[PDB]
Amino acid sequence: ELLKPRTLADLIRILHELFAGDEVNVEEVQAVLEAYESNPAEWALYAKFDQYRYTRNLVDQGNGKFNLMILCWGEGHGSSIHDHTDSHCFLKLLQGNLKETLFDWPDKKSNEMIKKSERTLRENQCAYINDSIGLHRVENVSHTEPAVSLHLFSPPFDTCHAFDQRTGHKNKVTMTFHSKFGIRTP
Numbered sequence: 001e002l003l004k005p006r007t008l009a010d011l012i013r014i015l016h017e018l019f020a021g022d023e024v025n026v027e028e029v030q031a032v033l034e035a036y037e038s039n040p041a042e043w044a045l046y047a048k049f050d051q052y053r054y055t056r057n058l059v060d061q062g063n064g065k066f067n068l069m070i071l072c073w074g075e076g077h078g079s080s081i082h083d084h085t086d087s088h089c090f091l092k093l094l095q096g097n098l099k100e101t102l103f104d105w106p107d108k109k110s111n112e113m114i115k116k117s118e119r120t121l122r123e124n125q126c127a128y129i130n131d132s133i134g135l136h137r138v139e140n141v142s143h144t145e146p147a148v149s150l151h152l153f154s155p156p157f158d159t160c161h162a163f164d165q166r167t168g169h170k171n172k173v174t175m176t177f178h179s180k181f182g183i184r185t186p
């Protein structure tokens with residue numbers, strides 16, 4: 001029985017219940033993430049920006065079943081085209097807007113990766129992707145508003161691939177945490 005998370009802390013408790021088992025009910029997880037109404041005071045601790053690129057700020061380690069983190073996107077900051085390492089990715093906007101562009105998995109032959117679609121994710125909306133669906137790029141295209149998003153990955157992963165839009169060629173990337181539990185981790 002899914003209830004509305006009253007706060008970020010409550011959300012986290014509910015997520016621990018939803019991931020108590022070995023599988024993931026994706027529609028339920030998405031519904032509870034969507035139902036949490038972003039309250040900036042609750043997540044200010046985690047919203048640590050960098051001038052030059054987006055940051056990844058760990059909020060909860062999910063008892064090993066998932067990682068919950070907050071990503072902070074300066075104006076004009078965005079990601080590569082990337083996969084999610086055979087894991088679930090849920091993304092909820094906490095502040096601002098992000099452009100999500102979807103791409104198919106490339107064929108072996110070198111070719112421009114043509115965007116399949118795009119959407120603008122607005123405050124409080126939750127998107128979902130996994131590798132069976134495809135690849136995406138996430139970008140804060142705003143010139144005036146920083147963006148903040150809440151990401152849940154299950155199982156946790158710290159490596160993925162970035163894809164060259166000109167060719168489809170992939171490279172392995174190791175991701176890093178800007179902070180963990182509110183603490184900057186150089």
Ligand SMILES: N[C@@H](CCS)C(=O)O
Pocket residue numbers: 056071079082089091138151175
């Ligand atoms: N997976 C990317 C963010 C977009 S989902 C990351 O963890 O930095």
Ligand SMILES: [Fe+3]
Pocket residue numbers: 082083084089136138
């Ligand atoms: Fe992603």
